[PDB]
């Protein structure tokens, strides 16, 4: 393998894809970034640690731009108004074989599959209900 | 519409799909398990609450159990041998439209789509490199 | 899906049943309240809670108002004569399946099925014999 | 003329049907109790006892025992894994006629009728949403 | 019944009509929200609970934004100058029938209805003169 | 012009109608009674400050009294047995335009509506479900 590669983060289908490649590497922290400023960019970055004796933990961060109404290469102030933050935290027992980390995955992509609640949600602007 | 709504968890081409269904919303914490004994049960919570004035923070938790059945004082209990703990928190700008949520939601399913790099780390038990 | 909806707490066969209607569902109780004055009404309420590690405890309440009119230097109020208080406690280890509680559930119905002992010796202001 | 008899407490639809008989009737406190091993079997027992000058109040108590086999040094015995205790108060004022009783005893029926919100919320491991 | 849908708050004639969704139920809250950004939105909630021993309180908020001058989707600060509050709270004794609540909701209506000094005064940015 | 006028507060289609008039504006409140005895009129109040250096809030107040006549002595005095009291409280930058004014009572008006949740939750004696 060699996961460290370029991949499409936001797919409209073909046009208008956003794209994030590997951009740091400093201490084994992966990073990768879209093609902007740091202050509109789109990034993503991803680490594993034995967070204790029984569990790893893979500690993912995303941030997206806030788009409507931007001003591409602007100074857009403050930085909290446009930008959105992500932060994910998975915490996995020693135990876990390779199927039962297939089986997480499956399961996190569900959580996000369309039309699925939570994400359905989000995208509305809304809470449960 | 009511968006508390049972959805598939872990989707196992139809035989074997983990499914969950509202459980619970008391204290505003949306609840779902799966059709197990609580012991056992997949687990899903999300909750929203306005962190500053400015940002909404939605709180999502899964929880994937590995199921055994213990002998406990020479009786047999069903179990879960460990349990695996995702954990998302997505702050949210209060001036996000919903064009911008829909970004974000497709930025999270990017992220995790089969073949991307963080799913293939974590399946594998390997770190990004 | 919603559990948190109206019912008929009192079948009269269609006629003068009695229904309860979603009322407040503040710190995880849920309560139902049946229509016109809240002082002639009928109130139900319900929460669950993890009792201790290995129980879940169900708090049901029921309140029956006897219905009358206070009459008090000639102004007339629409008021309870008194009330009947039901108070149940259902506690439920973790380690049940969804087959356990519903038999844990018709065991419940069982007991106050017409004809049996308990209900009719309620329906009687008897005790047993 | 006597309501201490036995009855059916779990409609299994005539088979399987979980009957409890009378077993004790000290102090005033009626016991039922189902054939087979005491270890494993479901028990309820009532009171009724003048709570105040007003008021007269009924306990209703039932266990329901999970059947299961401890094994022990290859000793095993028929116990029960473990049980869930129903907890009932009732209490109806000196005034209540009999017909206000046969309506207390309605609104009991109707609070775990199937299909209503408190039975099918216990029926499912769940709480109210 | 089932109150919790969407409706029309701001009845521009069928054109330009604002309609208002449900988006959140946490604790009971109702919470109906336009398609915007949460910056910008049209927001309303309710909820009710009983205040003292003899009173039930409707807890009633809504958020309208300024329009004039509005940048759609635009992060506009501060927040304070683009934003009006309603806050209402109605207090209703025990004793009020169905009847005596809908008088109650006409004296609400009337209070409002075009023509009247109240909302003339707010619409012409003016005091009682 | 004078907004200060009489208006019909409960609109019972020409027969019954409460309509309330001018009756003080002492100390900048302008307040409105019907035509009764001071102890069983209905009563609205309205004034409006510049809360903050760049708000402006309006306070109403209704009170609907439920009439009575009650024996205080061996003597009958009009009284009401109980009110009901709205209180709203109206926040609205400076910035606002006479139009965008306008907007806050059209949203106001639709809130109330009849056949809108809110209006209908209130008359029933329910909250919003």
């Known amino acids: ?21 590997p951009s740091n590497f400093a201490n084994g922290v992966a990073e990768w970034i879209s093609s902007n400023s740091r202050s509109q960019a789109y990034k ?13 933990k893979y500690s993912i961060k995303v941030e997206v731009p806030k788009v409507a109404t931007q001003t591409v290469g602007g100074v857009e102030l403050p930085v909290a108004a446009w930008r959105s933050y992500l932060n994910m935290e998975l915490t996995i027992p020693i135990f876990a074989t390779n199927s039962d980390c297939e089986l997480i995955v499956k399961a996190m992509q569900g959580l996000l599959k369309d039309g699925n609640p939570i994400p359905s949600a989000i995208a509305a602007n809304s809470g449960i209900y």
Chains 1, 2, 3, 4, 5, 6 share one sequence.
Do not use: P, W
């Not at 991949?7 to 794209?19: A, E, I, P, R």
């Not at 993503?44 to 790893?56: E, F, I, L």
């Open 1 to 21: 393998a060699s996961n460290f590669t370029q991949f499409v983060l936001v797919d409209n289908g073909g046009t208008g894809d956003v794209t994030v490649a």
């Open 44 to 56: 993503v970055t991803c680490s594993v640690r034995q967070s204790s004796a029984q569990n790893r």
